[PDB]
Design a protein around this ligand. Structure first.
Ligand SMILES: [Zn+2]
Ligand SMILES: [Zn+2]
Ligand SMILES: [Zn+2]
Ligand SMILES: [Zn+2]
Ligand SMILES: [Zn+2]
Ligand SMILES: [Zn+2]
Ligand SMILES: [Zn+2]
Ligand SMILES: [Zn+2]
Lengths: 215, 212
């Protein structure tokens, strides 16, 4: 399974939403591909008018890239809803399968599978599923990192991230869980939360990949 | 159309008593003449097929199970597209064609369970098991049958032209067909379905499978 150039658009998409920038080598890392590989992908994306090199902000999406990225998100999430709920895929299995299929599936297939799934609006990660030709506008944008108010929160959405999956397994975190934010340990650099009468410190690194909402 | 597509063409061209040529293959799948050579030459290197002056090309045991797996993928996908995504017959091929080349064995093996182990595809084609060689339950083609009587249309070839032929003759899988006469000189058969009579060239009769 080899991710094509287009997957760079999906990573740039969320980075732009979170309003932060990393190097192409760091993007290549989380993309599980060589650095010189991403350089060739971005090279192709520039020629095909999918991204532009901004003087200051780095690499940005063109309107053509937003559309193609929004389209990939809908197909990716619609496919993993089917794989998990119908074909009985586990969370650690869905990504690689939904990845190959999002590049080899007709619009008719996609827009009929939608009807088949009764028009789901969120994937197993809690990410919004936009309608045909609609730009992806996430329902859940609030990241635990930066959160000021203490009290009870609900875990509504997490990133499509294998490592984050294993973190949530070894800590028993599920979408929909009530976790009480006690404080932000400045010294530790971790948000201290309480779940089921058990304290856990969440490093701000992890806290940035999680989305919450208050009761 | 990758090399694996050529195997499915050689496999179903082997059912015909006629020997296989390069020029007829490029016609069957309507592609460049030397392109068939460029591809068939690759098949001969990997020992997927081999030359035989009596049949032209033959599928090796590796070619058999490899194409056998292809038919499995293709057909399981056909059952899903039609019974669950409500695809019509004119829509299923290109979709199933793309997916069979981009889907894990895990996907194929789980869709199989999900569909409750379907035994035949929309064309009446048999669905083999993982790693199991393909043996069609319905092997008897209309071209060749001599006994008179009432036969049942059990299976058809995956062919776009055959689809059109069947729907403009309102022919479905399951219809009772009575053999009336066979023209040995012309290579045509004469059948009857509910009083209505129809003439069928032997070439078309080789694309259809019947049983008594
Ligand atoms: Zn992709
Ligand atoms: Zn994924
Ligand atoms: Zn998701
Ligand atoms: Zn194929
Ligand atoms: Zn087909
Ligand atoms: Zn079929
Ligand atoms: Zn299999
Ligand atoms: Zn009629």
């Amino acid at each position: 399974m080899t991710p094509n150039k287009e997957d760079y658009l999906k990573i740039i998409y969320e980075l732009s939403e979170r309003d932060e920038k990393i190097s192409n080598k760091q993007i290549a890392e989380k993309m599980s591909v060589s650095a010189p590989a991403v350089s060739e992908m971005v090279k192709k994306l520039l020629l095909e008018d999918l991204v532009l090199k901004d003087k200051q902000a780095g690499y940005l999406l063109t309107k053509k890239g937003q559309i193609l990225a929004s389209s990939l998100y809908r197909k990716h999430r619609l496919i993993e809803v089917f794989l998990m709920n119908h074909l009985n895929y586990t969370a650690d299995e869905i990504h690689e399968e939904a990845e190959v299929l999002e590049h080899t599936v007709s619009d008719v297939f996609v827009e009929r599978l939608d009807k088949f799934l009764n028009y789901p609006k969120v994937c197993p990660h809690g990410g919004t599923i936009p309608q045909h030709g609609q730009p992806l506008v996430e329902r859940y944008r609030t990241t635990l990192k930066g959160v000021t108010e203490m009290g009870v929160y609900l875990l509504k959405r997490v990133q499509d991230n294998f490592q984050l999956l294993k973190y949530m397994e070894q800590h028993h975190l599920k979408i929909g869980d009530e976790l009480r934010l006690l404080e932000y340990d400045a010294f530790a650099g971790a948000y201290t939360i309480e779940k089921d009468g058990e304290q856990l410190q969440v490093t701000s690194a992890v806290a940035s990949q999680i989305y919450i909402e208050k009761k």
